Amino acid sequence: VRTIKVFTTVDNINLHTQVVDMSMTYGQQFGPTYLDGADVTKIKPHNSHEGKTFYVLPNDDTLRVEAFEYYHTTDPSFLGRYMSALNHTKKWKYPQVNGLTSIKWADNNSYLATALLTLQQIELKFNPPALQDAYYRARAGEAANFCALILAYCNKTVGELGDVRETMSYLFQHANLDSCKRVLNVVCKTCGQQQTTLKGVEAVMYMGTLSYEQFKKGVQIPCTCGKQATKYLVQQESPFVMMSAPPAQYELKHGTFTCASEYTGNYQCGHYKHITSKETLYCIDGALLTKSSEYKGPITDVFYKENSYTTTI
Numbered sequence: 001v002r003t004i005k006v007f008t009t010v011d012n013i014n015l016h017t018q019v020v021d022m023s024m025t026y027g028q029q030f031g032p033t034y035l036d037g038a039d040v041t042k043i044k045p046h047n048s049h050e051g052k053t054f055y056v057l058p059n060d061d062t063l064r065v066e067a068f069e070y071y072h073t074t075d076p077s078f079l080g081r082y083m084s085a086l087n088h089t090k091k092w093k094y095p096q097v098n099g100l101t102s103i104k105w106a107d108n109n110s111y112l113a114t115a116l117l118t119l120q121q122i123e124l125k126f127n128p129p130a131l132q133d134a135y136y137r138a139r140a141g142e143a144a145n146f147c148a149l150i151l152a153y154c155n156k157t158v159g160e161l162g163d164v165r166e167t168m169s170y171l172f173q174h175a176n177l178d179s180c181k182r183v184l185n186v187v188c189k190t191c192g193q194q195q196t197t198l199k200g201v202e203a204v205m206y207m208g209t210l211s212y213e214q215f216k217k218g219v220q221i222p223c224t225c226g227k228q229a230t231k232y233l234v235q236q237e238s239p240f241v242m243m244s245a246p247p248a249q250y251e252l253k254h255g256t257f258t259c260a261s262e263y264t265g266n267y268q269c270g271h272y273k274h275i276t277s278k279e280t281l282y283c284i285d286g287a288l289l290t291k292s293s294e295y296k297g298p299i300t301d302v303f304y305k306e307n308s309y310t311t312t313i
């Protein structure tokens with residue numbers, strides 16, 4: 001019996017001593033087994049494999065509990081979807097652009113680069129340690145794992161067309177936004193006034209206008225009675241807000257926003273770029289950078305800083 005030693009793990013923190021028979025495939029001894037993203041289930045052991053760390057699908061209670069504690073999911077497909085993505089994201093380039101980790105364009109990844117650039121500019125703590133650890137590594141320039149996890153958590157495959165607002169929404173559901181509170185007043189001529197409090201993700205995202213200012217002053221929404229009604233922001237408690245709308249020509253002014261998603265072309269199959277407000281306006285298109293003092297173009301998301309806001313209406 002000829003038998004190299006390996007480490008199996010689900011989280012790459014808790015490592016388990018295994019000794020594998022070299023005649024038998026990984027699959028027959030561990031179930032599904034990955035190396036650096038690459039499915040090696042059906043492959044048998046090489047000599048250059050001795051000592052390395054393989055991810056396995058959890059097949060005992062120890063590993064199921066370690067997988068939940070690391071990823072915050074029991075979904076049995078999660079590991080395989082993460083590894084399939086990693087197999088591509090490890091080949092992407094992550095250039096520093098204007099002090100931010102970006103992604104050189106590949107595999108329809110503009111939405112992922114736009115999301116990654118945005119997450120380096122807003123205050124967020126991820127609940128799953130997997131995501132938090134990968135986020136720190138991405139901020140320091142090694143973003144392959146983090147991008148693979150974003151795809152796995154969003155149920156997206158490499159190449160699939162993605163929406164930055166939907167991606168941010170899924171990521172926010174995996175983050176600690178409990179202290180986040182939004183109070184709205186709705187004013188109708190007939191039913192009158194009703195206030196509602198939103199918490200968590202719904203406290204930081206709005207779909208309908210790009211202007212935080214315009215949200216504060218009020219926006220026109222259909223009333224359940226039949227009238228048009230006015231919805232306006234009463235109180236906001238969050239470190240940022242995300243304002244979204246269908247793409248339309250919009251003017252971005254230096255110093256009045258943190259960053260924004262530019263979207264050009266048809267529904268679904270267009271291209272995102274990222275506008276960030278520094279000492280001037282920078283436009284990050286993957287590996288490409290341009291700057292200008294002014295900007296007008298097709299914007300679909302604008303991010304703004306917040307801490308505590310109460311209206312004077």
Ligand SMILES: C=CCNC(=O)Nc1ccc(C)c(C(=O)N[C@H](C)c2cccc3ccccc23)c1
Binds near residue numbers: 163245265268270
């Ligand atoms: C609820 C999920 C079903 N929708 C999608 O898969 N949407 C999706 C996927 C990928 C992309 C790029 C988009 C998308 O086109 N988003 C932009 C920002 C967008 C968002 C909203 C309305 C739009 C209208 C016209 C053109 C673009 C619009 C939308």
Ligand SMILES: [Cl-]
Binds near residue numbers: 072073
């Ligand atoms: Cl959870």
Ligand SMILES: [Cl-]
Binds near residue numbers: 087089092106107
């Ligand atoms: Cl690739």
Ligand SMILES: [Cl-]
Binds near residue numbers: 128
């Ligand atoms: Cl979570």
Ligand SMILES: [Zn+2]
Binds near residue numbers: 072127128
């Ligand atoms: Zn969780």
Ligand SMILES: [Zn+2]
Binds near residue numbers: 088107158
């Ligand atoms: Zn690829």
Ligand SMILES: [Zn+2]
Binds near residue numbers: 188189191226
């Ligand atoms: Zn009414």
